[PDB]
Amino acid sequence: GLFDKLKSLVSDDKK
């Protein structure tokens, strides 16, 4: 609902 969409954004930074 929040960090879930935040953790999914930071879970990359390089792909």
From Swiss-Prot:
Subcellular location: Cytoplasm
Signal peptide residues on this chain, from the entry's feature table: none
Subunit structure: Heterodimer with glycerol kinase (glpk).
Physiological role: The phosphoenolpyruvate-dependent sugar phosphotransferase system (sugar PTS), a major carbohydrate active transport system, catalyzes the phosphorylation of incoming sugar substrates concomitantly with their translocation across the cell membrane. The enzyme II complex composed of PtsG and Crr is involved in glucose transport.
Domain notes: The EIIA domain is phosphorylated by phospho-HPr on a histidyl residue. Then, it transfers the phosphoryl group to the EIIB domain.
Protein name, UniProt field: PTS system glucose-specific EIIA component
Organism: Escherichia coli O6:H1 (strain CFT073 / ATCC 700928 / UPEC)
Chain's gene name: crr
Boundaries of the shown chain within the full protein: 2 to 16 of 169
